Design a protein around this ligand. Structure first.
Ligand SMILES: [Fe+3]
Ligand SMILES: [Fe+3]
Length: 309
């Protein structure tokens, strides 16, 4: 009898108490999981981790409560005047960025959703740039379920920090870099590929499928008038390497410089998140197993960023 609407689980973050139930779908039935009054700050977030949760459901009659919950979370989290714990702010903002990316992946023709994601990417740059511990707090949020939207947020975070180290200050460029990084793996959306394995031990079939993703991703968006060219370039070129060994065979001179940055940042998170490489060993691995693929200055800066420098 009752109607439900879907919500993305990355929107359930921080210490605000929910004024709605939330349900997990099991065997196509809506099973009560989160109750009115629950919150998700600190260790409470574990209730939503390691469970491959993507969508949950709320009663349609409670949708207004959810919408107000989300808007309050976002407004409070981006506010630099509150003195709110940085980890809680980061929990909310990381999840909101992920939500915005998922909305674009699910609705790529939607101009408003793209523009919302773009505007929020600008807000994200400002959050990371204006709060000393923001990057560290975001990097504390492990990608337990190995999703491409969480991975996009992580890659965008490393990309913002890398851009700062390289002296790329133009706000339009940093916004588009962040947006492209967030969306970079659109080509993997609803792919049967298990990303959580090393590329060099994938079956030939899996590797072949993997090589298609930037090409397919870019082809899908390249003629959409509302997509920024830089974002299209990042989606399509982010697997390219400076010595021309990537899927498109591009060399550094052939590439959007911002895609070179995302390529480096991505290569690092792939090692750490998808291949189980300890963060302190990732730079070495790229240099010794990914010879000549990325600019040494990017790898050194990324190593420093992961070290807190
Ligand atoms: Fe990729
Ligand atoms: Fe990636």
């Amino acid at each position: 009898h009752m109607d439900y609407v879907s919500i993305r689980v990355s929107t359930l973050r921080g210490d605000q108490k929910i004024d709605f139930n939330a349900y997990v779908k099991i065997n196509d039935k809506m099973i009560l999981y989160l109750r009115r009054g629950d919150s998700f700050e600190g260790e409470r977030l574990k209730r939503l981790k390691d469970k491959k949760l993507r969508k949950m459901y709320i009663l349609t009659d409670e949708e207004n409560s959810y919408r107000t919950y989300l808007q309050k979370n976002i407004e409070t989290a981006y506010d630099d005047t509150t003195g709110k714990d940085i980890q809680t702010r980061a929990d909310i903002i990381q999840g909101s960025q992920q939500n915005n990316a998922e909305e674009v992946f699910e609705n790529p023709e939607n101009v408003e959703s793209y523009n919302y994601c773009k505007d929020a990417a600008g807000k994200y740059v400002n959050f990371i740039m204006s709060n000393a511990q923001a990057l560290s707090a975001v990097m504390n949020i492990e990608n337990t379920d190995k999703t491409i939207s969480h991975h996009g947020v992580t890659v965008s975070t490393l990309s913002i920090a890398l851009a700062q180290k390289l002296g790329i200050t133009d706000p339009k460029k940093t916004q588009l870099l962040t947006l492209g990084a967030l969306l970079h793996d659109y080509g993997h959306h609803h792919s049967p590929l298990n990303l959580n394995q090393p590329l060099d031990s994938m079956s030939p079939e899996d590797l072949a499928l993997w090589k298609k993703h930037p090409i397919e991703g870019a082809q899908k968006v390249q003629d959409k008038k509302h997509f920024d060219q830089t974002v299209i370039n990042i989606i399509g070129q982010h697997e390219e390497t400076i010595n021309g060994t990537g899927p498109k065979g591009l060399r550094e001179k052939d590439m959007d410089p911002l895609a070179v940055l995302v390529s480096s940042a991505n290569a690092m998170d792939r090692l750490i998140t998808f291949e189980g490489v300890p963060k302190a060993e990732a730079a070495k691995k790229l240099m010794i197993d990914h010879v000549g693929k990325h600019p040494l200055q990017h790898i050194q800066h990324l190593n420093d960023i992961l070290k807190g420098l």
